[PDB]
Amino acid sequence: LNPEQVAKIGAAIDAGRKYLDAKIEEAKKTLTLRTAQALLVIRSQYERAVDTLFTDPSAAEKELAATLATIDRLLKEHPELAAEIKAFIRSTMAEIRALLAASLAA
Amino acid sequence: LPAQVAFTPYAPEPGSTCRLREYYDQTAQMCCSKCSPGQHAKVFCTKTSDTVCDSCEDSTYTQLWNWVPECLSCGSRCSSDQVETQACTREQNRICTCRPGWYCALSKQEGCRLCAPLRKCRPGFGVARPGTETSDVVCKPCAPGTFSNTTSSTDICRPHQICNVVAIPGNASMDAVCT
């Protein structure tokens, strides 16, 4: 990875983290604190799933699956919100994986 | 506990806060027990039942007295490039860091998810900005009058020696030789 690729990869990771933090702040502003608590857990698993792309790529798809299952489980009673978070996290991880594959292929 | 001492869950009297190990739950409108570090709220309190706290499973944690519905995931195990400066336990997250001579290319809130070796400025080049925990060394070519004869992440461009009668002039990678 050259500095340009790392910067693009970091920007994608920050986008997912910042989206999750905004969803937490939104749950706090609307006083849906039990949802804010669930989002903290989902954020922690997102961070682990991102870590694994760099520390152990052979585990990445399993950690992504565990992220989406955690969203499904914790937000089972808020399906609209659950769909928004899965879609942001899926799209974010697709972009990071795309940048990684493109750098390893050069 | 005797009849004198209120148990959770209870509604706090006007002018009160909840006890130290309690939080005010807005859904029950009651003071309810928090769970300890290493546990989480398996079941939230209601108006008639207290929080149910269960232990975190391996590779998850809670660092504070809490009422999260599941424990948080530890960060992934460190790669061989990194050093694990804090272990994952049921009460604390894993922290991975970079070795001396390396910087953190992708930083986490705590620690690092990707380390990279610091650049070394070759002879003729000196350190312009030193490396930091999260940033690579920046090099510069040595301007006339200065030099660097080493390959190094810390050595800077240093002045040529002064002398009136030059046998061999100095350049960017070697000192002047004086007669």
Swiss-Prot record, chain B:
Residues of the full protein shown: 23 to 201 of 461
Protein name: Tumor necrosis factor receptor superfamily member 1B
Disulfide bonds: C18-C31, C32-C45, C35-C53, C56-C71, C74-C88, C78-C96, C98-C104, C112-C121, C115-C139, C142-C157
Self-association state and partner proteins as the record states: Binds to TRAF2. Interacts with BMX. Interacts (activated form) with XPNPEP3.
PTM text: Phosphorylated; mainly on serine residues and with a very low level on threonine residues.
Glycosylated sites: T8, N149, N171
Positions annotated as TNFR-Cys repeat: 17-54, 55-96, 97-140, 141-179
Record function comment: Receptor with high affinity for TNFSF2/TNF-alpha and approximately 5-fold lower affinity for homotrimeric TNFSF1/lymphotoxin-alpha. The TRAF1/TRAF2 complex recruits the apoptotic suppressors BIRC2 and BIRC3 to TNFRSF1B/TNFR2. This receptor mediates most of the metabolic effects of TNF-alpha. Isoform 2 blocks TNF-alpha-induced apoptosis, which suggests that it regulates TNF-alpha function by antagonizing its biological activity.
Extracellular compartment segments: 1-179
